[PDB]
């Protein structure tokens with residue numbers, strides 16, 4: 001195997017096998033890195049300015065890069081596995097026009113990640 005690379009994943013509605021409304025805001029694929037004996041994923045979101053916070057498996061995002069022009073950011077999370085489901089949280093805050101009409105949105109959600117990374121890279 002390889003201790004770094006890309007991995008496919010999907011974001012599911014919490015504790016279901018259904019695609020989350022959140023899923024479109026997550027760029028695919030992510031990357032993974034194994035370092036200091038631990039496993040990490042590096043996930044890029046779009047509409048970054050709408051997503052005020054993220055955590056996975058109880059760990060808050062560590063923002064490693066931002067692209068202000070594309071309204072994207074890349075966040076690193078420690079994970080217990082590269083293949084399988086891990087619950088996470090996302091905070092969303094929107095206050096701007098949608099189709100010309102003011103829209104406001106302020107929610108904190110649970111989500112379930114399904115990671116489809118390699119099975120031969122252990123912690």
Ligand code: HEM
Nearest residue numbers: 012013014019020021022025050051090092098109110111
């Ligand atoms: C204009 C933008 C958006 C609209 C109109 C919208 C609308 C909705 C609606 C109607 C629900 C169902 C709530 C319920 O029935 O209780 C929902 C749930 C949800 N939304 Fe939002 N949403 C928007 C943006 C976002 C964004 C940017 C994210 C995250 C990046 C997000 C993440 C979620 C999550 C995680 C749920 C819970 C159910 C699921 O996982 O699909 N939404 N949204």
Ligand SMILES: [Cl-]
Nearest residue numbers: 055057058088
């Ligand atoms: Cl979490």
Ligand SMILES: [Zn+2]
Nearest residue numbers: 091106107108
């Ligand atoms: Zn809030």
Ligand SMILES: [Zn+2]
Nearest residue numbers: 106107108109
């Ligand atoms: Zn809410």
